[model samples]
Target: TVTIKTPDDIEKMRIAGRLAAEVLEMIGEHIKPGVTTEELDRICHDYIVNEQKAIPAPLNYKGFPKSICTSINHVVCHGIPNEKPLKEGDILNVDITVIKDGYHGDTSKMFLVGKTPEWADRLCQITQECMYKGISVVRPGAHLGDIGEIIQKHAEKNGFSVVREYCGHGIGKVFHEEPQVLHYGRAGTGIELKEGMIFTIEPMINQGRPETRLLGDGWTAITKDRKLSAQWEHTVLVTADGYEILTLRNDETFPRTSA
Candidate 1:
């Protein structure tokens, strides 16, 4: 069942959300030429454990075995942290989820290693716009499919494809819960959203087709055509009038809808 958070729960969610965003804030300086994904993982792990005194939610999530997810270039979601060093013009996605005070906050964003290809930068920009467009539709009495409709419309307008395998989800005390939020669907369909309902709206946009192929490692999804894939995530709550972006960073323009 979906959990409608109480005021106490809401307060904890805010703290957890801010803490998750903090990790992404500090990691930007480290995401540069020659830095390995594994290095980023360790840095985030130490920050969450030492500074925040919180749990890194992805470390053993469904046996994921990583402190964070590091999907680079053609890689989609769930790219396990690895030793491969980032090179010039590479685009990467670092997904973060943290547990604080028994609640969870999940968020992610795209990072350009250096002077990335023009097309790659556009994909990231458009993908983020897709996320915000989806977010702008959130309000009491809205349909879950309304979120998907807006995101798909924006992605297709920019000549991008929406990955279909994964969708956003309900999050609170548990890492993932009910309300699977799809990124592509017709509006006026699916379940209706209500106040106090919190969920994620993370759309994975691909430069190629929506098709994906899972690697032999049992993780790390990649685009079928090997073209670059980008995604942005945020956690949000349905409010009396509209919605709140729980995991938003200070630098982001408009966001939510986390991991």
Candidate 2:
């Protein structure tokens, strides 16, 4: 069953979310070429474990090996950090999750390494725009389908495709939770957004086909047509009016187009 966070729980989640955001910012600056994904993993691990004294939620959770997920270029979510160095024009999404005071905070962002191509840059901007499009519609009593409808319309209208296989999800103490939040759905369906409820609205947009294939290692997920893909995520709490973005970052401001 889905759990509604109380006022006290929301407070705890705030701290957890802030810490996770800090880790994302710290690792984002070091995403240039010559840096291995494993090295990025070490940065996240040290920040969460040594500095913040928190647990890297993804580490060893459900057999995941790394402390953080380092998805580069065409790789979708859950890309295991490896020794491969990121090159110029590569796009990477780093997902960070931290546990603090028995609560979990999770969020993700896409990074454009060095010089990015026009098509890829526009795709990234559109994908990020899609996330806030969904977020702007979030409010108490708002249908969950509202979120999906907004995301799908913006993506399809832009000539991009949305990934159907993996979508947003309910999140709290556990990494994954109930009420599977798909990116494509009718406007008047699914669970209603209730006050105190928390979840993520991460839409993975693809420039080519929406299909994906897993790597030989059985962990990295990449686009099937080798087209670029990008994603953005945030831990949100439904408020009486709308919602609060608990994972807001200090270094990374809201996308200028968000307003």
Candidate 3:
């Protein structure tokens, strides 16, 4: 069932969301070449647990094992952090989720390893735009499909494919909840969105085909063709007037393009 957050619940989420964003920012500064993803994970885990006094939601979520997900290059999502050091010209996605005061904040963004490829940079930028496009369509009376349609349209127009195996979901007291949000759908075809609904609008766009394969670890997802994939996520809230981005970063400089 879809969980509608109360005003007090929303406030708690804001705190959790802001902390999650701060953790991302803290880890990003240490993401240069030669650093192992495991090292970065340790940094974030300490910050969330010790500094913020919050819980790392991904730390054992369904036996995920890592404090955060570090998807490198072609890996779609759920990439486990390992001892392997990141190299120049590589790209990675760092997904962060934090729980505070019993509420959850979930968000992720791509990070460019030193001197990333030009094509990879474009993919990251466009994927973030897809996320914003989906968020831009969120309003009290909108349909869930409307969000996916706009996101898919923009991704395809930019020569990318939307990953279908994984999708956004309602998040609050629980990490994942009802009303699954797809990144590809026909407009006005799914459930009608209503006020007080909280969910994520994360779009994973692939440079190649949308097909994906699961690694032997049973967690990391990667492109079938071993090409690049990028994703950006934001938790959103539906209000009387429109939608509010609960996980928006105060340091974000990317321009939001209207869908």
Candidate 4:
């Protein structure tokens, strides 16, 4: 079952959501080719805690040691911060979650380090397109399957595969909640949408096969074929008329229908 947020709850969510997006917005200049993922995580942790007076949900949640997830290149998701330098031609995904007043805001974006290859750029763009396509159909009375179906349709049309191991989850007072939004499913199935419902639609798209294998450390998920993977995420609110992108970045486009 899903929770229907109240007007007050929605207001608190908006604040948390904006704080999360701001972190992503402010961290781009610091992501140079040689910077370590640990450095990036440190920057985010400081900003979220010291400046914004918020908490990074991933810092200690479920034994996650880092404040942010820096998944680069072949890493699909949950790539913990490390000392390895991110070189040029790398595509990385920085996923952020900011908790404010007990509400959580979650979002992520693909960052092209320095001059990335054309294939990597295209994969990142297409992955984002899949996310927006799903968000475009969100509204009261719409089925969750509509969101999944559109996402899968667009990715497969572009010769990409959606990772099945991890799907988007609802967010409110908790970090992950119900509705279990999948990136691939049939259109007419699943739960019905309603106003005040909030969740994330972060799709992980792969250039090779969708199969993924977790590292021994227990959090990082890398593509089994070692091919490139890209992901884009945003916390979406189901509005009375349609949807509102709660964690939308200042640089990203709305209604991103094309790759």
Candidate 5:
């Protein structure tokens, strides 16, 4: 039940994607020690509204009040922005999703607050590796499960665990769409990628158990074991030959596979 986008639709997505990336990069300069998540939220809201002339998709989506998701340290995803100020050695994930025209673009990245622990750096690197490796398997005829299989293998081989409760979803005109993309699955199974299909591949890797809990506000999702988790996401368009990452930001380079 995946909806394939038309060429014109892809064009609209490109606009949204570029805006999403810009928001992430623009806010990147502000992520550091002493900065509060709510302050980060204000920066994002201003950029998306003033510069991009677009809507922060998650602000009202599912009643999420914040313009951006500021997940720090043990927080997994949907960590609501608050008065908490980032500290040294803290790794934060800023998830940005924008609505432009009628399409949606989603992307996020993990940032180092100050200095990071060795294990934190390793986890971030490995989780990013898993994301790139999973996306590398995408092709018109490739099975969707191929994405998850690669992610699971890479994480497990590195002594990390993948979160099973949440999964990536098709993103385009709608915020969340069909063809749920899990981070763990059997290869050669599930729906096949097709030309013009748009979606996101976001792997949320955990340092301990894969379980999570919601905050009192019912928005923040923190790791159950109180262990660190990091994530990155990109919106992509499936092509006959391969795929194009729609939400790629110029500030952050794509992970090289061979290394």
Candidate 6:
């Protein structure tokens, strides 16, 4: 069952969400070509624990060892951070979730190591557009599948595919909750949206087939065709008039149709 956040709960979520966005902002400044993903994780882990006095939600989450997920190139999701140095022409996705005052905030963004290649650059831009497209359709009375329909339509129209293995979910007091939010579904189907519902609409788009494979480490997920993949995420809340983005960064330049 979906848990509705009260007015007080929403206020606490706002604090959690802004802190999560701040972590991404701080990490973005350090995501240079020579920086290792492990280093990036360390920076965020410190900021969350020391500066913000918040908890990194991904630490030990279902046995996930890292504080942040660093998915690079073909990695679709759950790519653990490592010591390998990133080079020019590489794309990286840093997924961060922070818990504050007992509420959770989750968000992610794609970053270019240096001068990225044309294919990888376009893939990143399109994947981000797909995420906003999904968010644009969210509102009270809208069907859950409406979110996926817009995402899949935009992704496929741009010559990409949406990952089916992992979907967005309800999030509040708990890390992962009910009502699986798929990125590919028919319109007017699935559950109906209502006010006070909070969830994420993270869409992972691929430049190849939708199939994915898990790494031996049991966390990283990669494209089956060895092609590039990109993802963007934001936590949202259903309001009386529409939905509010809880994890929008202050320095965000991505195109968002939702206002």
Regions of model 6 farther than 4 Å from truth: 253-259
lDDT, model 2, position 85 = 95
TM-score of each: 0.97, 0.95, 0.97, 0.97, 0.96, 0.97
In what order do the candidates fall by lDDT, top score first?
4, 1, 6, 3, 5, 2
The ten-residue window of minimal lDDT in model 1 covers 250-259
lDDT of 2 by residue, 1-259 (tens): 6688888888898999999889987887788989999999998999899999999999998888999998888887789998899998899899999999778898998888889987888888899889888888888878889999999999999999999989777777777787787877778788888888889888999998899998887788899999888988888788887878888887656641222
In angstroms, give how far residue 198 of model 4 lies from its true place: 0.3
Off by over 4 Å in 2: 252-259
lDDT of the candidates, in the order given: 0.92, 0.86, 0.90, 0.93, 0.89, 0.91
TM-score, candidate number 4: 0.97
User: What lDDT tens digits, residue by residue, belong to model 5 across residues 166-217?
Assistant: 9999988899999899999989999999988999999999999899998888
| Alpha-carbon deviation at 9 in model 1, angstroms | 0.4
* Superior by lDDT: candidate 1 or candidate 2: 1
Lowest lDDT 10-residue stretch of candidate 4: 250-259
Query: What residue runs in model 3 are displaced by over 4 Å at the alpha carbon?
Result: 254-259
lDDT of 4 by residue, 1-259 (tens): 7999999999999999999999999899999888999999999999999999999999989999999999999999999999999999999999999999899999999889989988899999999989999999998889999998999999999999999999999999999999899999999789999999999999999998999999998999999999999999999999987898888777876842211
Error of 1 at 228 (Å): 0.7
Could you tell me how far off, in angstroms, the CA of residue 36 lies in candidate 3 after the best superposition? 0.4
On lDDT, the candidate that comes out on top is 4
Give lDDT: candidate 4, residue 155.
90
How accurate locally is residue 8 in candidate 4, as Cα lDDT from 0 to 100? 97
The pairs that clash in candidate 6 are none
True-structure RMSD for candidate 4: 2.3
> Which 10-residue window of candidate 3 scores lowest in summed lDDT?
250-259
RMSD of each: 2.2, 2.1, 1.9, 2.3, 2.1, 1.4
Candidate 1 segments whose C-alpha is farther than 4 A from its true place: 255-259
